[PDB]
């Protein structure tokens, strides 16, 4: 169920500096190209090893779209202040998300084209790639502007065409890499969290992709009660971490068992204190 997205952001700040423009590209949730106007030399750059097969004209080409989007956001950012009657001494955020999802059969499932202002939905192209959905009164002015200029048929073109065309092209070059997984390594820690009681924490470390599942069971029923779970955290080296725990009556620890479910294990890990 491959996919491709481009997360774009332009933020304005008080001062003499023009707003910063940042664009990040993803193929199957993985970052592969990024562009920051704060760089010493603004340019789209490789964020995955496979993209280093692309020639200079590719980089020069995308970089130029980059340069164009910048003005487009700088200008659009200015039109928003007018719409909302805002002032000049603050900071505002305009974000964009656009892309296409493909099935395993390489067939296009859906196109995406939506924008947010100040982190709230502003305007979005509907699933028919023909009609718009405007969130507020401001959004209405943009909707009309785009309906009269016939913008939908042009983003639709990119989404059913260029987006599908190129995404396949990428998957072809980087499927070997993408498919790559990292089996989690697990262990259980003991902590004095009370007298008569205690805490066991099941650790899952260095696994990729992020998707994982941790369970606890006293030979039989999985302990959903009194179990603590943390959001999956990045270790900073590409892989991720996670842990789950449960209060456990002191001296009874070695009777509880932990299970780790991740797509990289020849089979789910099972361990105990």
């Amino acid at each position: 169920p491959h996919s491709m997205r481009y997360f774009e952001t332009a933020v304005s700040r008080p001062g003499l500096e023009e707003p910063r423009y940042i664009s990040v590209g993803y193929v199957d949730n993985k970052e592969f190209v990024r562009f920051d106007s704060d760089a010493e030399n603004p340019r789209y750059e490789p964020r995955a090893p496979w993209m280093e097969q692309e020639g200079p004209e590719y980089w020069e080409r995308e970089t130029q779209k980059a340069k164009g989007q910048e003005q487009w956001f700088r200008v659009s950012l200015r039109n928003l202040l007018g719409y909302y009657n805002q002032s000049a001494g603050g900071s505002h955020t305009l974000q964009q998300m656009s892309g296409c999802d493909l099935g395993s059969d390489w067939r296009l499932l859906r196109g995406y084209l939506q924008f947010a202002y100040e982190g709230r939905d502003y305007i979005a192209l509907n699933e028919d790639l023909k009609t718009w959905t405007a969130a507020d009164m401001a959004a209405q002015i943009t909707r009309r502007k785009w309906e009269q200029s016939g913008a939908a048929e042009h983003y639709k073109a990119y989404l059913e065409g260029e987006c599908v065309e190129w995404l396949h092209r990428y998957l072809k070059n980087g499927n070997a890499t993408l498919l790559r997984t990292d089996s989690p390594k697990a262990h259980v820690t003991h902590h004095p969290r009370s007298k008569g009681e205690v805490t066991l924490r099941c650790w899952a470390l260095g696994f990729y992709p992020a998707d994982i599942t941790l369970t606890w069971q006293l030979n039989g029923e999985e302990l959903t009660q009194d179990m603590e779970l943390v959001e999956t955290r990045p270790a900073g080296d590409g892989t991720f971490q996670k842990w789950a725990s449960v209060v456990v009556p002191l001296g009874k620890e070695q009777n509880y068992t932990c299970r780790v479910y991740h797509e990289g294990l020849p089979e789910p890990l099972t361990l105990r204190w």
Binding site: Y6, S23, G25, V33, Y44, E62, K65, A66, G68, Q69, W72, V75, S76, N79, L80, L94, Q96, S98, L113, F115, Y122, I123, T142, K145, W146, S149, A151, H154, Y155, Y158, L159, E162, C163, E165, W166
Partner: peptide
């Protein structure tokens, strides 16, 4: 390949 916006907001 990145999108290229049309009409501004």
């Amino acid at each position: 390949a990145a999108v290229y916006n049309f009409a501004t907001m």
